Ligand SMILES: *[C@@H]1O[C@H](CO)[C@@H](O[C@@H]2O[C@H](CO)[C@@H](O[C@@H]3O[C@H](CO[C@H]4O[C@H](CO)[C@@H](O)[C@H](O[C@H]5O[C@H](CO)[C@@H](O)[C@H](O)[C@@H]5O[C@H]5O[C@H](CO)[C@@H](O)[C@H](O)[C@@H]5O)[C@@H]4O)[C@@H](O)[C@H](O[C@H]4O[C@H](CO)[C@@H](O)[C@H](O)[C@@H]4O[C@H]4O[C@H](CO)[C@@H](O)[C@H](O)[C@@H]4O)[C@@H]3O)[C@H](O)[C@H]2NC(C)=O)[C@H](O)[C@H]1NC(C)=O
Ligand SMILES: CNC(=O)c1ccc(-c2cn(Cc3ccccc3)c3ncccc23)c([N+](=O)[O-])c1
């Protein structure tokens with residue numbers, strides 16, 4: 001119930017929200033059907049439109065008008081945005097040359113530069129170039145301020161997940177808005193774009209920027225606008241709030257535009273109909289900047305122009321139907337479209353089996369345009385699993401396609417020509433970032449970055465301490481003129497042991513064998529020095545990784561590689577080696593095929609054993625440092641030490657062997673040497689964070705050897721590829737992966753072919769940031785470089801996407 005007989009007089013777009021049944025006059029009252037009886041009359045005036053004209057200049061104030069051109073309007077804070085231009089001979093903001101804003105130039109009584117976030121739904125990154133002729137205000141923002149060529153959204157590349165990520169710095173799995181549509185089985189409630197459930201605060205986790213501000217004494221405008229409030233009114237409301245007394249004025253504001261998304265769905269991302277929506281959004285930006293100029297705020301406010309996701313060509317005919325795959329299609333509920341989420345239709349149906357649904361959806365049609373995954377097997381870069389609102393079965397849909405349950409769903413619902421929601425590395429899903437104002441840099445281009453990083457920056461722009469989030473604070477310092485955040489490296493929690501030779505060969509009873517009893521004073525001191533760390537500067541180029549949790553581990557040195565060996569997990573946490581451009585690949589010799597050698601630095605009790613592998617009919621083993629890249633026949637023996645062995649399914653070994661034998665050398669050739677750090681990951685509860693020992697669900701049969709869920713590699717070289725990886729003077733370049741450790745290659749539909757036809761395609765799908773690997777291992781990389789720490793944070797957030805231009 002709402003007692004809509006209260007009044008909005010003096011309350012239009014009030015900031016504090018009033019509680020039922022009292023009627024509301026705030027910017028969301030329409031969405032709740034709760035506005036007072038006179039809200040349209042008082043708050044949504046439209047008389048005479050949005051622009052001053054010559055005949056209105058100096059008019060007698062008429063309170064009915066949408067905006068004013070009377071002499072008093074500047075002090076009332078409610079002139080039309082073009083008032084000074086039409087009536088006082090001023091120029092539009094867009095027609096002024098840009099001039100660097102070296103310091104905030106703010107009116108007296110401003111405690112800080114305000115922040116205005118201008119969010120545009122569906123604004124695909126390539127519109128900045130492709131539409132630049134029809135968007136002069138935006139182009140001036142972009143060319144004069146700080147811009148990225150694009151900004152990566154979060155998955156799924158839908159509106160509600162992305163806007164809430166922008167506001168919180170959190171992945172959707174952590175903030176809880178995991179799609180535009182959701183079912184929460186604990187609440188037993190559904191969240192939908194239409195209707196009232198979405199207003200319940202229980203769906204919305206983390207802490208959004210407007211709450212972070214309020215808690216710390218910075219006032220915020222309300223970020224949401226009911227759809228029927230016209231854009232011109234949203235802008236004039238922001239400008240009016242900016243004219244409030246100091247004690248009442250917010251410091252942070254957001255504008256939201258449903259365009260160009262709304263038209264992009266109907267017409268496709270580059271439909272000829274799209275030009276007009278782009279023109280209109282530009283004109284709104286112009287109104288805001290003209291309005292700031294009239295208030296003498298145009299060199300005071302930081303403006304962020306930012307999109308939630310892009311837009312792809314998608315039509316009804318490019319729909320896959322689960323009814324063409326599944327016998328039991330009436331026993332499932334599908335959340336359809338540009339991603340699929342499957343659960344049981346009835347929790348009382350005990351004949352429902354995820355395994356049989358996955359198998360019926362796997363590589364069934366030659367050009368199949370979706371791929372099924374149990375959610376824990378999704379690429380780790382998506383961070384899309386740790387929430388009970390995310391169904392166990394997920395369908396990744398190819399760009400340009402939809403998935404639906406049955407044909408009748410699609411024609412009893414061709415209308416549309418555009419959609420979004422696909423994998424967030426897809427080029428058409430990328431969106432925009434421009435920052436303009438005193439705290440941003442002048443005419444500066446920055447590399448692409450992820451929208452999870454902006455919350456920290458928006459907190460920095462406002463002097464707020466960010467709530468805990470998934471950005472890496474400091475990684476966007478290069479966007480800013482001032483207000484940089486200067487983090488310190490985390491402290492190492494565990495220091496390594498450096499064991500020497502402590503065990504005789506006969507103390508080991510590991511069931512291993514090796515043909516190495518093949519028998520010099522020059523060469524003996526030499527091998528001793530390698531075991532003491534004499535080649536370590538070649539193979540550990542950026543310092544040893546720091547271990548950020550309590551554990552017991554050993555540093556082990558060798559001619560060709562260095563490792564940090566966990567006495568708890570019985571394998572390395574990391575193995576580091578450098579391969580120069582000139583390195584040669586060799587084979588594993590015949591006499592060494594099944595060679596595993598005890599490591600006399602590490603006790604039998606802290607070692608793996610061969611007999612467990614022999615007995616585990618499912619499980620084989622591989623090596624972290626690859627024997628193929630040994631520097632000499634004699635150094636190759638080091639590669640067969642039991643301390644370099646890790647458990648691997650035979651199907652996985654196909655992938656790993658090709659990576660090690662072919663791809664490492666290929667990258668060394670292309671990049672002028674590479675430094676590689678490889679290791680295991682254990683994430684059995686799919687939370688993106690390192691498992692403790694007591695979370696491990698699977699061991700090599702009969703043993704305490706834990707089975708990794710994933711294997712990572714971090715591959716680092718010099719950004720200036722004219723310098724070798726091991727003698728780099730300047731910035732680094734990196735690519736990384738987190739490969740799922742699976743007992744089959746069902747993910748790769750072409751896996752019966754030669755590895756040259758499918759392995760690298762698998763690795764590109766599982767591309768990762770160094771930061772992803774850090775969360776998953778509790779290690780901290782790049783501790784000893786010549787580079788600034790902020791620069792290294794940016795490197796750790798880089799994702800190599802393999803998307804074309
Ligand atoms: C991305 O950044 C985020 C933010 O930093 C990272 O997320 C944090 O990770 C922490 C570890 O997973 C986690 O810390 C836990 O907090 C528990 C208290 O949680 C509440 O309070 C906080 C603070 O206000 C709040 O933010 C939480 O909000 C979550 O929960 C509600 C749902 O009820 C949601 O609305 C909200 O969206 C959010 O959900 C997300 O997180 C939860 C987990 O908290 C998930 O389950 C959801 O799926 C979703 O992803 C909460 O309201 C605290 O109780 C935990 O402590 C337990 O575990 C420790 C281990 O150290 C143990 O010592 C304790 O005894 C305790 O164990 C007991 O409970 C167990 C489970 O019932 C039981 O088995 C034991 O036997 C014990 O009884 C823990 O400290 C922190 O909450 C989240 N924060 C957020 C916002 O998500 C995230 O890791 C980053 N991602 C990456 C990849 O880096
Ligand atoms: C048909 N869909 C709509 O009309 C529509 C869809 C989404 C939103 C919306 C606005 N913010 C606030 C905001 C603004 C800028 C940056 C971050 C956050 C969100 N934060 C989370 C989820 C949805 C929204 C609104 N809106 O303005 O209320 C309308």
Ligand SMILES: [Ca+2]
Nearest residue numbers: 121122159308
């Ligand atoms: Ca959107």
Ligand SMILES: [Ca+2]
Nearest residue numbers: 683689690691
């Ligand atoms: Ca984990």
Ligand code: NA
Nearest residue numbers: 613616619620
């Ligand atoms: Na075996």
Ligand code: NA
Nearest residue numbers: 745746748751
């Ligand atoms: Na396969």
Ligand SMILES: [Zn+2]
Nearest residue numbers: 122261265420
């Ligand atoms: Zn949309």
